[PDB]
Nucleic acid binder design. Sequence first.
RNA 1: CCCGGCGAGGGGAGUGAAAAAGAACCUGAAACCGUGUACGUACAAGCAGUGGGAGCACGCUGGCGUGUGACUGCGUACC
Length: 450
Amino acid sequence: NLTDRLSRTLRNISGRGRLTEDNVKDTLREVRMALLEADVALPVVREFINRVKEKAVGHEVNKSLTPGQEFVKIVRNELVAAMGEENQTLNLAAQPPAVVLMAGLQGAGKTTSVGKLGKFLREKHKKKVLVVSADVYRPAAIKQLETLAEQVGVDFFPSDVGQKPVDIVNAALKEAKLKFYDVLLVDTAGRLHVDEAMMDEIKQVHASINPVETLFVVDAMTGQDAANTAKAFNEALPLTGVVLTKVDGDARGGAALSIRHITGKPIKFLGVGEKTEALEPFHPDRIASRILGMXXXXXXXXXXXXXXXXXXXXXXXXXXXXXXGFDLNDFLEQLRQMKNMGGXXXXXXXXXXXXXXXXXXXXXXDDKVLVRMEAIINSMTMKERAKPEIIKGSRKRRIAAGCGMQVQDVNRLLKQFDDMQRMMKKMKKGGXXXXXXXXXXXXXXXXXXX
RNA sequence: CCCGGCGAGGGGAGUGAAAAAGAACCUGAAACCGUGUACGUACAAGCAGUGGGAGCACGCUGGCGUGUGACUGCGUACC
Ligand SMILES: Nc1nc2c(ncn2[C@@H]2O[C@H](COP(=O)(O)OP(=O)(O)NP(=O)(O)O)[C@@H](O)[C@H]2O)c(=O)[nH]1
Ligand SMILES: [Mg+2]
Ligand SMILES: [Mg+2]
Ligand SMILES: [Mg+2]
Ligand SMILES: [Mg+2]
Ligand SMILES: [Mg+2]
Ligand SMILES: [Mg+2]
Ligand SMILES: [Mg+2]
Ligand SMILES: [Mg+2]
Ligand SMILES: [Mg+2]
Ligand SMILES: [Mg+2]
Ligand SMILES: [Mg+2]
Ligand SMILES: [Mg+2]
Ligand SMILES: [Mg+2]
Ligand SMILES: [Mg+2]
Ligand SMILES: [Mg+2]
Ligand SMILES: [Mg+2]
Ligand SMILES: [Mg+2]
Ligand SMILES: [Mg+2]
């Protein structure tokens, strides 16, 4: 949670006019102690913050002379170029065959990441995927891959602990070339970088498969040893890329920076939940912005994921509002669809303009509130949903009693639907550019918060 | 919380000693306007009361108060 420390830091800087180099210094020190609190590659903390120090001395901006915009912009863009220079769109280069391996320390997230890639590339590539587990060591690891593969709808190549990993992956590659697959995901056992028999074993594995891609998997909570791990794995194995996992934790995962300092290999993907859908393309703009608290890249990516899962359902709510007008039917459809894409952190990060006025500790529980709405509007007869104005006291007693909640809550939800009804009408009558530009941010006077 | 137009206003709830203290806010008079009950009034002439007076209603403990006042004597405001 750098944003607590980095917020006091870079926000402190963004206050003071024509800042002395001393609070510049102190702020750098707090970024250092902040990344030190994040257990990111402590020597690489020192290096990074020395770089930020040298960069932050002589900048001038006519737009706004504020040095805090300079520290925020510098820390951002510098973490950006050090983390691979805005590589989101690029990802991995696809050839008609592709063979990718997942390697790294015990428990970093390799098996999970393999299935995430499977799902993601299954969606984007429109092609066929085969996966295989080279892990004969961890109990039930193969079964884990089989389960994940069955869940993501990806062909699974069987293997058991009684075999040799080389023979297994050789068989897998053979079957794959025979059955005309393209993307191949090979999940390997977790291993210490200082374990020679294992590292040799998978040097042999790589030698047998001849992969186009070797991906090192990093827990974002990985410590100072990262630079030592990445190098080791890059010296024997050598890796062509990096995946950074568990970024949904408060760990800042700048260890990958060390990993990208030694290796020089791009970081392709951000693991952002425990679910298969949780593979994101990595992007330094997104991780650095995510740290800083306000983001333009993650705003366009969460509005484009919301718009992708909600396209046919907002066109279903727009067709029913074209025929019967806006009802609790079109609203309820909006509710279930809205509950399926639901998350709060990907929503507040999309809007920096509203988060500048309100506390960043603001959270509505979407899983709670949304499903509550679905439930309450599941307690209405179809006439009350298509004709909401007839909902009365006894009706709200009935609705409140049906879902096992309070009448006040139902009042609140019908209030919400009232506001969204109005908004639907205002959107209907006015031109899109006028209705979007005429929205007012009200202060009861320019004096703030009152 | 409820009725209503996401109104006006209201009704519960809650604060308070008190909300017939609710911002159209201490006390809250008269004129003026009403809802409710008793009595009288649709063959009756006039400064509208006063003297007499039947009945009816309500209080009391067969009488005493209270309201009303059918019917008749006298009766043309104040400055
Ligand atoms: N929250 C979260 N959990 C993740 C992410 N990626 C992996 N995990 C989780 O981390 C745990 C370890 O993952 P696993 O795939 O077994 O890692 P592995 O590197 O294959 N382990 P091994 O070295 O034993 O083979 C699993 O619980 C899994 O669900 C992530 O991006 N976010
Ligand atoms: Mg594994
Ligand atoms: Mg009101
Ligand atoms: Mg009280
Ligand atoms: Mg008054
Ligand atoms: Mg007083
Ligand atoms: Mg008063
Ligand atoms: Mg009064
Ligand atoms: Mg009065
Ligand atoms: Mg006659
Ligand atoms: Mg008569
Ligand atoms: Mg007359
Ligand atoms: Mg008398
Ligand atoms: Mg009596
Ligand atoms: Mg008497
Ligand atoms: Mg009497
Ligand atoms: Mg008389
Ligand atoms: Mg006289
Ligand atoms: Mg006369």
